[PDB]
């Protein structure tokens, strides 16, 4: 009856409906990008000092003049489409933490969280980059 | 500024969600962390370590072109192409009543099949660490017409069960009929929403251990499967669906449906709601006359029915001519010239309502109604061969299909009629004994005029080439055992044969005189 509080904007409607249904949400998304379709927008974006660690998973926003900062769970595909999480049981990486992304790569934050993984050494992005290896 | 879905609208009664992390979308983060159209982390106002927020699954809106991925809504045309892949689907539901409000849960699901599955209200709930698929409070809708819903709140069943029961009830109904599914629905929105529970989507996949494309998916272990060869499979892999109302009807479903079909009375139950959707689907499609450009591949033995059919026709229309010696034969319902007994002295007049264009010089364009035409063909004999109608005229030779029988060939229709698919699906009126009031039933017999040529058998009925003797005459003794087979078959195809009453097996022997 609405009668309720609105979470989402229309420009993400089709994109979300897709991956909600898909057996493999990850693929479905990357493909939607292939098909020339728009990336998920509306993520929570952080107003920041921009001085801090470059690390990707942090308990308060930490950015670089290179990075921009995001409330983690808006950058989570599984969190955003409200479907089960790829970790077997049951839990998220990015809910309750802040996530960092290079400003150039920042256009598609939802994707960037899928595409890449965090070095357990320096707790920082692999390749975007990392001192290890 | 600005517009919103709400798809995934937050249905919780909490004022002030949501910390900027553990907030799905910028849109919902408390006003408190928002500034200049941004968000900022204030350690002072903490994230809640416990909360439960119902996320609405309504408003799904899926139209997207992704190369490896199939359009799941199909054209009326492409929909006809697969008929009875068809299933009616309408979900009745319940609203979230206590810890939250503003969304619709799937209470009871129903089908073109008689089946009604009821589920316990369940929904998608956001917590700190995840989303969680879980039971929920609910109440039945306000209307007095919705009062029949109240008890079903208790009735059952867990969704883990229901999506399994669904796939079987579907699996065995569609196994021999088709390679895919199409859901046929009147108001498509809520049912699409209901679909989220049982339906996973993806690019076309070939079933494990089989040739045919995949209907089902099982999460128990990642696999794909097949209409026949699934079991204990919880999800449907790539359903298709057609919204009938999208064809631009005027009123509510029952309004239009009832215009045509009087056989379905409504009890507001989901099934009955989903049956009336197939009717309209079928009527608005197949009671228009017999489009011949549409080819439905056969499984199976349509051919052995097809041959055995012509065979029996020729036999009786040849005999009937010999017996009573009709000057003219009126063939009603012959699109193409096609004399059934190609050689007969008789004037062969053709009549049809939709005569094929070439060969239209041979045919009168006519629609037969016993009211109008009981007079109009007196002289000679009339042939209605699978031309189904207003009750048949006194002098006639007719084959009508009996709708009541079921085979994978024939499907339900409106109203009480059956849509029959051999090739070029043939919708036929429901079987009415009043149609045959003027005729009588056709007893089995054989006739062959020929020279005669493993174990022999005597038959009280075959006017036979040679009856002086037993007389099992090895050439007809074979042919008669073969034409009785193909006759026993078309009878079990459901068909019936009806002849003018005057007809007598006897008069066929006088053609043996000389
Ligand atoms: N319940 C209904 N069943 C029907 C109807 N029309 C056909 N049928 C049945 O479905 C089948 C469809 O007939 P189809 O046209 O697809 O079969 P054929 O491929 O063998 O026909 P043709 O090869 O195109 O040529 C047949 C010619 O033979 C004659 N003919 C036409 N129909 C028949 C039949 N049913 N039995 C015997 N002889 C028939 C007529 O002159 C035809 O022009 C057939 O087996 C019938 O049992 C129908 O209106 N209702
Ligand atoms: N009430 C009616 N009056 C005249 N023709 C009719 C009719 N109902 C159906 N028909 C025609 O009969 C045909 C049905 S197909 C029946 C096939 C025919 N006996 C054959 O030998 O193949 C169609 O062309 C349809 O146009
Ligand atoms: Mg509906
Ligand atoms: Zn998540
Ligand atoms: Zn490192
Ligand atoms: Zn009906």
XYZ file of C-alpha atoms and ligand atoms in Angstrom:
727
model
C 0.000 0.000 0.000
C 3.090 2.233 0.393
C 2.847 2.503 3.355
C 6.633 1.880 3.365
C 10.145 3.290 2.830
C 11.832 3.293 -0.572
C 15.315 1.792 -0.872
C 16.002 1.950 -4.621
C 15.959 4.188 -7.689
C 14.549 3.006 -11.114
C 17.849 3.205 -13.040
C 18.914 0.039 -11.177
C 15.596 -1.797 -11.615
C 16.315 -4.111 -14.578
C 19.950 -4.695 -13.546
C 18.883 -5.834 -10.077
C 15.917 -7.904 -11.226
C 18.390 -9.779 -13.414
C 20.935 -10.852 -10.825
C 18.247 -11.485 -8.213
C 16.989 -14.301 -10.401
C 20.291 -15.544 -11.899
C 21.885 -18.767 -10.645
C 25.270 -17.130 -10.950
C 24.847 -13.486 -9.902
C 28.481 -12.646 -10.551
C 28.407 -13.658 -14.215
C 25.012 -12.107 -14.824
C 26.377 -8.753 -13.737
C 29.630 -8.763 -15.702
C 27.574 -9.764 -18.749
C 25.033 -6.993 -18.263
C 28.085 -4.747 -18.491
C 29.060 -6.461 -21.737
C 25.608 -5.966 -23.233
C 26.278 -2.249 -22.890
C 24.008 -1.889 -19.889
C 24.552 0.605 -17.083
C 26.432 -0.376 -13.885
C 24.694 -0.215 -10.500
C 24.622 3.357 -9.212
C 23.239 4.875 -5.980
C 25.984 3.440 -3.786
C 26.692 5.258 -0.509
C 29.622 7.582 -1.193
C 31.801 8.924 1.628
C 32.798 12.538 2.295
C 36.355 12.104 3.445
C 39.602 13.662 4.604
C 41.164 11.564 1.849
C 44.205 11.149 4.061
C 44.481 7.711 5.616
C 45.493 4.173 4.753
C 44.874 2.885 1.245
C 43.456 -0.380 2.616
C 40.213 -1.689 1.104
C 38.457 -3.082 4.174
C 38.443 -0.642 7.129
C 36.256 0.191 10.142
C 36.095 3.897 9.230
C 36.580 5.561 5.841
C 40.217 5.595 4.772
C 41.023 7.054 1.392
C 43.853 8.260 -0.815
C 43.903 11.251 -3.098
C 43.771 8.238 -5.425
C 40.857 6.392 -3.786
C 37.263 7.431 -3.123
C 35.304 5.868 -0.249
C 32.061 3.878 -0.001
C 29.829 2.402 2.671
C 30.688 -1.215 2.112
C 27.307 -2.902 1.842
C 26.184 -0.703 -1.066
C 29.214 -1.952 -2.982
C 28.246 -5.538 -2.259
C 26.318 -7.157 -5.101
C 24.846 -9.888 -2.901
C 23.883 -7.357 -0.230
C 22.333 -5.120 -2.823
C 20.225 -7.797 -4.569
C 19.307 -9.402 -1.254
C 20.354 -12.919 -2.207
C 22.520 -15.455 -0.380
C 26.218 -14.702 0.075
C 29.017 -16.573 -1.776
C 30.686 -17.412 1.548
C 29.127 -20.767 2.415
C 27.800 -19.642 5.788
C 26.539 -17.109 5.837
C 28.316 -13.871 6.044
C 29.419 -10.756 4.219
C 32.807 -9.097 3.912
C 31.629 -5.520 3.373
C 28.640 -5.007 5.633
C 29.632 -2.888 8.607
C 32.903 -1.711 7.064
C 33.982 0.917 4.535
C 35.355 0.009 1.117
C 37.866 1.938 -0.948
C 38.181 2.201 -4.726
C 40.520 3.974 -7.154
C 38.818 7.149 -8.386
C 39.106 6.072 -12.029
C 37.751 2.601 -11.341
C 35.148 4.117 -9.013
C 32.393 4.350 -11.639
C 31.491 0.683 -11.142
C 32.042 0.086 -7.423
C 29.704 -2.907 -7.227
C 31.805 -4.655 -9.856
C 35.202 -3.721 -8.455
C 34.351 -5.700 -5.303
C 33.759 -8.811 -7.411
C 36.672 -8.404 -9.831
C 39.391 -8.081 -7.188
C 40.502 -9.578 -3.880
C 42.349 -8.247 -0.822
C 45.906 -9.264 0.045
C 45.896 -10.861 3.521
C 49.371 -9.413 4.000
C 49.013 -5.631 3.831
C 45.206 -5.744 3.868
C 45.372 -3.706 0.675
C 44.114 -4.134 -2.897
C 45.920 -6.646 -5.089
C 47.346 -4.864 -8.133
C 45.567 -1.527 -7.628
C 47.913 -1.995 -5.910
C 49.967 -4.025 -3.459
C 53.626 -4.112 -2.368
C 53.631 -7.872 -1.799
C 54.321 -10.378 -4.580
C 13.760 14.919 -7.593
C 13.772 12.142 -7.311
C 11.914 9.049 -8.553
C 12.012 5.636 -6.856
C 10.823 2.035 -7.453
C 9.994 0.861 -4.833
C 11.445 -2.520 -5.588
C 13.197 -3.630 -2.463
C 11.233 -0.945 -0.610
C 12.030 -1.155 3.113
C 8.931 -2.435 4.922
C 10.219 -2.299 8.518
C 8.593 -0.105 11.144
C 11.932 1.256 12.380
C 12.211 5.016 12.049
C 15.760 5.926 11.186
C 17.594 3.266 9.356
C 20.433 2.925 8.524
C 24.155 3.250 9.265
C 26.089 4.253 6.092
C 27.770 0.845 6.093
C 25.135 -1.878 6.458
C 22.932 0.394 4.378
C 22.097 -1.216 1.026
C 21.682 2.065 -0.754
C 22.546 5.742 -0.248
C 18.805 6.348 -0.431
C 18.387 4.721 2.934
C 20.982 5.917 5.397
C 19.696 7.997 8.228
C 19.338 11.689 7.543
C 21.835 11.953 10.378
C 24.912 10.874 8.331
C 23.893 12.771 5.178
C 25.383 16.099 4.069
C 25.786 17.893 0.711
C 24.257 14.859 -1.010
C 26.910 12.658 0.558
C 27.473 10.491 3.593
C 30.139 10.658 6.269
C 31.192 8.415 9.128
C 30.368 9.637 12.606
C 31.726 7.106 15.103
C 29.490 8.761 17.662
C 26.261 7.463 16.202
C 26.954 3.714 15.983
C 25.760 0.978 13.667
C 23.006 -1.178 15.195
C 24.289 -4.691 15.850
C 20.772 -6.050 15.709
C 17.953 -5.190 13.294
C 15.430 -6.868 11.001
C 14.104 -5.159 7.878
C 11.589 -6.705 5.468
C 12.586 -5.921 1.886
C 9.738 -5.859 -0.635
C 10.017 -8.269 -3.542
C 7.281 -6.506 -5.562
C 7.851 -4.518 -8.776
C 10.324 -6.795 -10.531
C 10.301 -5.271 -14.062
C 12.715 -7.397 -16.130
C 13.473 -6.416 -19.715
C 17.122 -6.669 -20.650
C 18.990 -7.829 -23.714
C 22.000 -9.922 -22.759
C 23.418 -12.022 -25.559
C 23.608 -15.507 -24.034
C 20.415 -14.917 -22.058
C 16.836 -15.776 -23.281
C 13.887 -13.323 -23.261
C 11.536 -14.912 -20.705
C 8.457 -13.077 -21.943
C 7.445 -14.257 -25.400
C 5.298 -13.036 -28.284
C 1.732 -14.241 -28.748
C 3.039 -15.861 -31.945
C 6.025 -17.650 -30.429
C 3.625 -18.585 -27.638
C 1.264 -20.398 -29.980
C 4.293 -22.165 -31.394
C 4.473 -23.834 -27.985
C 0.988 -24.547 -26.755
C 0.542 -26.481 -23.588
C 3.919 -25.686 -22.683
C 1.081 -23.493 -21.343
C 0.160 -23.343 -17.651
C -2.177 -20.881 -15.913
C -0.641 -19.220 -12.858
C -2.300 -16.813 -10.404
C -1.046 -16.265 -6.875
C -3.300 -15.082 -4.067
C -1.400 -13.479 -1.161
C -1.126 -11.906 2.305
C 0.286 -8.646 3.764
C 3.006 -8.237 6.391
C 1.198 -7.344 9.601
C 3.281 -6.768 12.721
C 7.016 -6.174 12.874
C 6.581 -4.549 9.438
C 4.137 -3.302 6.749
C 4.023 -2.452 3.053
C 4.667 -5.622 1.036
C 2.959 -8.721 -0.344
C 3.699 -12.294 0.569
C 2.654 -15.313 -1.612
C -0.011 -17.153 0.427
C -1.543 -19.594 -2.127
C -0.465 -20.592 -5.644
C -2.697 -22.248 -8.234
C -2.484 -23.654 -11.740
C -4.227 -24.757 -14.969
C -3.916 -28.051 -13.148
C -6.397 -28.570 -10.346
C -3.572 -28.069 -7.819
C -3.373 -25.426 -5.092
C -0.150 -25.087 -3.093
C -0.326 -22.949 0.054
C 2.794 -21.605 1.780
C 3.508 -20.048 5.171
C 4.066 -16.351 4.809
C 7.776 -15.860 4.249
C 9.908 -12.997 2.979
C 13.331 -11.501 2.590
C 14.758 -9.916 5.732
C 17.832 -7.702 6.049
C 19.990 -8.192 9.144
C 23.421 -6.921 10.138
C 25.426 -9.720 8.491
C 23.153 -10.811 5.629
C 19.737 -11.062 4.010
C 17.708 -13.936 5.364
C 14.852 -15.918 3.833
C 12.493 -16.427 6.748
C 8.986 -16.879 8.166
C 7.032 -13.698 8.826
C 3.867 -12.327 10.379
C 1.030 -11.658 7.971
C -2.661 -11.021 7.736
C -5.277 -11.768 5.069
C -6.499 -8.924 2.828
C -9.457 -6.751 4.005
C -12.115 -7.753 1.468
C -15.042 -9.975 2.424
C -14.237 -11.749 -0.855
C -10.841 -12.542 0.646
C -12.331 -14.161 3.773
C -11.829 -17.614 2.244
C -8.115 -16.907 2.778
C -8.073 -16.785 6.588
C -7.544 -20.470 7.478
C -4.763 -20.901 4.917
C -2.407 -18.914 7.163
C -1.838 -22.023 9.257
C -2.130 -24.620 6.528
C 1.540 -25.082 5.547
C 4.074 -25.428 3.993
C 7.748 -24.473 4.152
C 9.046 -22.883 0.952
C 11.849 -25.443 0.753
C 9.029 -27.959 0.342
C 6.794 -25.907 -1.918
C 9.395 -25.176 -4.576
C 10.127 -28.903 -4.671
C 6.453 -29.835 -4.957
C 6.148 -27.217 -7.683
C 8.896 -28.640 -9.871
C 7.498 -32.177 -9.693
C 3.875 -31.178 -10.298
C 5.283 -29.300 -13.284
C 7.804 -31.995 -14.224
C 5.273 -34.761 -14.666
C 2.620 -32.555 -16.280
C 5.005 -31.267 -18.970
C 7.355 -34.245 -19.395
C 5.893 -35.802 -22.551
C 4.181 -32.616 -23.733
C 7.079 -30.150 -24.107
C 10.751 -29.165 -23.697
C 9.990 -25.868 -21.909
C 7.363 -24.072 -19.824
C 5.265 -21.050 -20.444
C 3.297 -19.483 -17.648
C 0.052 -17.919 -18.804
C -1.057 -15.089 -16.511
C -3.696 -12.328 -16.276
C -2.233 -9.688 -13.971
C 1.404 -10.524 -14.255
C 2.980 -8.375 -11.605
C 2.413 -10.370 -8.433
C 3.086 -13.715 -10.078
C 6.442 -12.508 -11.390
C 7.128 -11.632 -7.747
C 5.982 -15.082 -6.633
C 8.426 -16.448 -9.161
C 11.466 -15.139 -7.278
C 10.922 -17.937 -4.758
C 11.157 -20.984 -7.090
C 12.776 -19.651 -10.287
C 16.476 -19.280 -11.100
C 17.546 -17.782 -14.464
C 20.493 -18.123 -16.881
C 21.744 -18.802 -20.421
C 20.477 -21.932 -22.155
C 21.719 -25.173 -20.624
C 21.607 -28.814 -21.692
C 20.357 -31.194 -19.005
C 22.851 -33.379 -17.187
C 22.771 -36.911 -18.630
C 20.444 -35.986 -21.541
C 20.157 -34.391 -24.950
C 17.292 -31.976 -24.296
C 17.491 -28.423 -22.961
C 17.174 -27.941 -19.184
C 13.923 -27.234 -17.348
C 15.076 -27.574 -13.734
C 17.867 -26.634 -11.332
C 18.891 -28.306 -8.072
C 20.876 -26.381 -5.469
C 21.419 -29.469 -3.308
C 24.223 -30.056 -5.774
C 24.801 -27.683 -8.653
C 23.250 -29.448 -11.671
C 20.797 -28.823 -14.464
C 18.000 -31.165 -15.508
C 15.231 -32.141 -17.846
C 11.455 -32.311 -17.749
C 11.449 -36.124 -17.464
C 14.777 -36.714 -15.791
C 14.622 -34.283 -12.846
C 13.659 -35.257 -9.341
C 14.106 -33.659 -5.960
C 14.978 -30.570 -8.008
C 13.859 -27.425 -6.191
C 14.054 -24.725 -8.882
C 12.801 -24.036 -12.414
C 15.714 -23.065 -14.726
C 14.325 -20.961 -17.588
C 10.562 -20.578 -17.568
C 8.776 -18.538 -20.211
C 5.617 -16.556 -19.671
C 2.958 -14.637 -21.537
C 0.663 -12.000 -20.059
C -2.721 -12.464 -21.681
C -4.068 -9.138 -20.495
C -1.264 -7.475 -22.464
C -3.365 -8.307 -25.548
C -5.627 -5.431 -24.532
C -8.834 -6.819 -23.107
C -11.417 -4.410 -21.712
C -12.349 -5.634 -18.231
C -11.331 -7.909 -15.376
C -10.378 -11.485 -16.251
C -13.647 -13.198 -15.301
C -15.570 -10.608 -17.340
C -13.981 -11.533 -20.651
C -13.447 -15.216 -19.856
C -17.137 -15.707 -19.152
C -18.195 -14.034 -22.437
C -17.049 -17.159 -24.254
C -16.789 -20.028 -21.777
C -19.650 -21.038 -19.417
C -18.038 -24.240 -18.133
C -15.843 -22.595 -15.529
C -17.730 -21.171 -12.577
C -15.536 -19.115 -10.271
C -14.622 -19.920 -6.710
C -12.002 -17.301 -5.983
C -9.382 -20.032 -5.393
C -6.039 -19.565 -7.162
C -6.331 -22.591 -9.454
C -9.746 -21.583 -10.761
C -8.317 -18.086 -11.225
C -5.449 -19.575 -13.240
C -7.638 -21.880 -15.321
C -9.769 -19.011 -16.552
C -6.511 -17.527 -17.831
C -5.766 -20.489 -20.096
C -9.327 -20.543 -21.478
C -9.090 -16.942 -22.621
C -5.596 -17.756 -23.816
C -6.931 -20.727 -25.816
C -10.132 -19.091 -27.049
C -8.615 -15.806 -28.091
C -6.114 -18.008 -29.924
C -7.507 -21.290 -31.310
C -11.236 -20.748 -31.827
C -10.264 -18.481 -34.696
C -10.187 -21.037 -37.500
C -7.389 -23.555 -37.952
C -4.259 -21.658 -39.103
C -2.213 -24.075 -41.258
C 1.198 -22.345 -41.263
C 1.893 -23.520 -37.728
C 3.785 -26.798 -37.369
C 3.727 -28.680 -34.052
C 6.345 -31.464 -34.080
C 4.863 -34.794 -33.028
C 5.494 -37.024 -30.124
C 4.194 -39.527 -30.600
C 2.418 -41.923 -33.002
C 0.355 -39.123 -34.497
C 1.439 -40.746 -37.769
C -0.035 -44.138 -36.971
C -3.189 -42.276 -36.006
C -2.884 -40.107 -39.136
C -2.683 -42.995 -41.572
C -5.126 -45.178 -39.673
C -7.495 -42.237 -39.896
C -7.505 -41.766 -43.692
C -7.628 -45.514 -44.115
C -10.877 -45.781 -42.148
C -12.366 -42.775 -43.915
C -11.844 -44.166 -47.404
C -13.177 -47.553 -46.394
C -16.506 -46.243 -45.066
C -17.061 -43.482 -47.601
C -16.391 -46.024 -50.378
C -18.784 -48.572 -48.874
C -21.487 -46.048 -48.078
C -21.455 -45.033 -51.723
C -21.686 -48.616 -52.941
C -24.466 -49.428 -50.503
C -27.105 -46.770 -51.087
C -25.871 -45.390 -54.438
C -25.943 -41.618 -53.781
C -26.202 -39.350 -56.887
C -24.254 -36.591 -55.146
C -22.050 -36.500 -52.055
C -21.935 -33.248 -50.104
C -18.502 -32.926 -48.507
C -18.699 -30.264 -45.847
C -15.426 -28.985 -44.445
C -12.996 -29.618 -47.298
C -10.419 -26.793 -47.516
C -8.715 -28.595 -50.380
C -10.510 -30.474 -53.162
C -9.130 -33.904 -52.249
C -11.787 -36.525 -53.016
C -11.463 -39.214 -50.335
C -12.534 -41.996 -52.661
C -10.875 -40.609 -55.726
C -12.841 -42.715 -58.185
C -16.618 -42.583 -57.939
C -19.302 -41.764 -60.487
C -20.813 -39.399 -57.950
C -21.033 -35.637 -58.196
C -18.643 -34.561 -55.480
C -19.537 -31.140 -54.132
C -17.182 -29.323 -51.731
C -18.161 -26.853 -49.035
C -15.922 -25.209 -46.411
C -15.856 -22.073 -44.261
C -12.172 -21.300 -44.896
C -11.356 -22.813 -48.332
C -7.656 -22.839 -49.294
C -7.175 -20.089 -51.904
C -5.855 -22.183 -54.757
C -8.573 -24.813 -55.174
C -11.169 -22.177 -54.258
C -12.839 -22.400 -57.662
C -13.796 -25.958 -56.730
C -15.319 -24.998 -53.406
C -18.383 -23.147 -52.168
C -17.658 -20.915 -49.168
C -20.077 -22.005 -46.480
C -20.683 -22.135 -42.729
C -22.940 -24.986 -41.724
C -25.589 -24.528 -39.053
C -28.227 -27.208 -38.645
C -30.737 -24.434 -37.990
C -30.200 -22.969 -41.460
C -29.138 -26.031 -43.465
C -31.316 -28.903 -42.208
C -33.373 -28.139 -45.337
C -30.687 -27.185 -47.731
C -29.013 -30.507 -48.498
C -31.669 -33.119 -49.061
C -30.535 -35.028 -52.127
C -27.636 -37.430 -51.771
C -25.314 -37.925 -48.816
C -23.397 -35.494 -46.594
C -19.911 -36.084 -45.225
C -18.709 -34.357 -42.095
C -15.246 -35.710 -41.389
C -13.845 -33.916 -38.370
C -16.014 -30.972 -39.223
C -17.615 -30.447 -35.861
C -20.927 -28.735 -35.445
C -24.441 -27.841 -34.647
C -26.205 -31.219 -34.677
C -25.678 -33.308 -37.835
C -28.327 -33.832 -40.612
C -30.262 -37.112 -40.996
C -28.389 -38.372 -44.056
C -24.707 -38.229 -43.210
C -21.406 -39.952 -42.607
C -19.475 -38.261 -39.796
C -16.364 -38.458 -37.672
C -16.367 -36.311 -34.536
C -13.650 -36.235 -31.917
C -14.752 -37.014 -28.354
C -13.196 -34.296 -26.202
C -13.596 -36.268 -22.970
C -10.711 -38.678 -23.677
C -7.220 -37.581 -22.733
C -3.965 -38.311 -24.529
C -0.820 -36.222 -24.781
C -2.331 -35.178 -28.103
C -5.335 -33.313 -26.707
C -5.390 -30.472 -24.238
C -8.158 -28.762 -22.279
C -9.961 -25.776 -23.807
C -12.999 -23.525 -23.719
C -15.643 -24.172 -23.046
C -15.444 -27.844 -22.241
C -14.049 -28.236 -25.743
C -10.561 -29.632 -26.180
C -7.675 -28.246 -28.163
C -6.372 -31.209 -30.103
C -2.831 -31.289 -31.407
C -1.676 -33.745 -34.072
C -0.524 -31.157 -36.465
C -2.124 -27.753 -36.888
C -3.799 -27.798 -33.508
C -7.521 -28.409 -33.958
C -9.896 -26.893 -31.463
C -13.056 -28.925 -31.203
C -16.391 -28.291 -29.462
C -17.250 -30.430 -26.463
C -18.881 -33.774 -27.132
C -22.657 -33.451 -27.306
C -24.943 -36.440 -27.826
C -27.627 -34.062 -29.153
C -25.386 -33.646 -32.210
C -26.019 -37.247 -33.171
C -29.785 -37.278 -32.564
C -30.468 -37.779 -36.280
C -27.715 -40.325 -36.891
C -26.825 -43.647 -35.299
C -23.473 -45.173 -34.403
C -21.291 -46.900 -37.009
C -20.710 -50.608 -36.269
C -17.334 -51.984 -37.294
C -17.082 -53.678 -40.681
C -14.647 -54.363 -43.520
C -15.159 -54.212 -47.266
C -12.907 -55.166 -50.145
C -13.800 -55.716 -53.764
C -10.892 -57.665 -55.212
C -9.288 -60.933 -56.304
C -8.024 -63.042 -53.404
C -4.368 -64.146 -53.149
C -0.192 -65.910 -39.970
C -2.990 -68.098 -38.566
C -6.406 -67.585 -40.250
C -9.425 -66.111 -38.446
C -13.122 -65.891 -39.355
C -14.983 -62.616 -38.823
C -18.779 -62.444 -38.659
C -18.322 -58.948 -39.973
C -16.366 -58.319 -42.992
C -18.319 -58.082 -46.159
C -15.346 -59.786 -47.723
C -13.980 -60.315 -51.157
C -14.786 -64.010 -50.791
C -17.433 -65.331 -48.391
C -18.703 -68.528 -50.031
C -16.193 -70.354 -47.838
C -15.060 -69.792 -44.267
C -13.671 -67.864 -45.798
C -10.246 -66.832 -44.585
C -8.617 -65.760 -47.829
C -4.983 -65.189 -47.084
C -4.817 -61.768 -48.791
C -7.897 -60.181 -47.166
C -7.393 -62.296 -44.078
C -4.245 -60.189 -43.757
C -5.743 -56.870 -44.871
C -8.791 -57.265 -42.639
C -6.567 -57.951 -39.660
C -4.623 -54.819 -40.660
C -7.599 -52.489 -41.240
C -9.236 -53.603 -37.994
C -6.006 -52.756 -36.175
C -5.873 -49.242 -37.604
C -9.596 -48.908 -36.818
C -9.214 -50.133 -33.235
C -6.504 -47.466 -32.959
C -8.406 -44.423 -34.183
C -11.222 -45.470 -31.849
C -8.758 -45.310 -28.942
C -7.582 -42.001 -30.309
C -10.974 -41.086 -28.898
C -12.706 -40.682 -32.277
C -16.229 -41.867 -33.036
C -18.019 -42.792 -36.275
C -21.665 -41.975 -36.954
C -23.714 -42.922 -40.015
C -27.150 -42.163 -41.402
C -29.532 -44.750 -39.978
C -30.779 -46.291 -43.249
C -27.288 -47.733 -43.749
C -27.161 -51.546 -43.638
C -24.092 -53.813 -43.764
C -26.145 -56.061 -46.025
C -26.470 -54.047 -49.224
C -22.729 -54.426 -49.706
C -23.147 -58.124 -50.612
C -25.368 -57.298 -53.639
C -22.277 -55.706 -55.178
C -20.919 -59.243 -55.193
C -23.680 -60.390 -57.562
C -23.089 -61.242 -61.242
N -10.709 -33.284 -32.900
C -10.316 -32.942 -34.272
N -9.385 -33.676 -34.885
C -9.020 -33.368 -36.148
C -9.592 -32.291 -36.829
N -9.015 -32.255 -38.058
C -8.115 -33.265 -38.149
N -8.129 -33.942 -36.991
C -7.378 -35.058 -36.545
O -6.085 -34.605 -36.344
C -5.270 -35.080 -37.430
C -5.061 -33.985 -38.376
O -5.232 -34.236 -39.711
P -4.003 -33.916 -40.683
O -4.498 -32.910 -41.747
O -2.919 -33.211 -39.825
O -3.431 -35.307 -41.288
P -2.803 -35.652 -42.707
O -1.333 -35.174 -42.826
O -2.797 -37.190 -42.827
O -3.631 -35.111 -43.860
P -3.032 -34.737 -45.359
O -1.766 -35.552 -45.552
O -2.723 -33.185 -45.478
O -4.057 -35.159 -46.411
C -5.289 -35.799 -46.075
C -6.477 -35.779 -46.967
O -7.283 -36.902 -46.629
C -8.508 -36.441 -46.140
N -8.566 -36.315 -44.696
C -8.515 -35.172 -43.986
N -8.614 -35.417 -42.668
C -8.733 -36.754 -42.521
C -8.865 -37.590 -41.387
N -8.894 -37.040 -40.006
N -8.966 -38.915 -41.577
C -8.943 -39.416 -42.834
N -8.811 -38.654 -43.935
C -8.706 -37.320 -43.819
C -8.681 -35.130 -46.745
O -9.184 -35.303 -48.039
C -7.341 -34.612 -46.715
O -7.175 -33.590 -47.597
C -5.976 -36.206 -37.994
O -5.301 -37.379 -37.641
C -7.288 -36.257 -37.372
O -7.356 -37.352 -36.547
C -10.567 -31.544 -36.143
O -11.198 -30.443 -36.755
N -10.892 -31.900 -34.889
N -19.528 -25.096 -39.193
C -18.766 -25.210 -40.280
N -19.296 -25.021 -41.544
C -18.511 -25.135 -42.669
N -17.164 -25.446 -42.537
C -16.658 -25.629 -41.301
C -17.423 -25.516 -40.165
N -16.632 -25.749 -39.100
C -15.393 -26.007 -39.550
N -15.406 -25.926 -40.903
C -14.299 -26.117 -41.834
O -13.924 -27.479 -41.841
C -12.517 -27.584 -41.846
C -12.122 -28.256 -40.561
S -10.661 -29.287 -40.853
C -11.563 -30.817 -41.169
C -10.870 -31.596 -42.263
C -11.637 -32.295 -43.390
N -12.685 -33.247 -42.981
C -10.539 -33.015 -44.136
O -10.818 -33.917 -44.908
O -9.351 -32.718 -43.982
C -11.933 -26.188 -41.907
O -11.630 -25.767 -43.225
C -13.069 -25.324 -41.436
O -13.042 -24.134 -42.177
Mg -2.722 -12.344 -10.646
Zn 27.115 -8.445 1.267
Zn 50.069 -7.108 -0.129
Zn -13.495 -21.433 -19.404
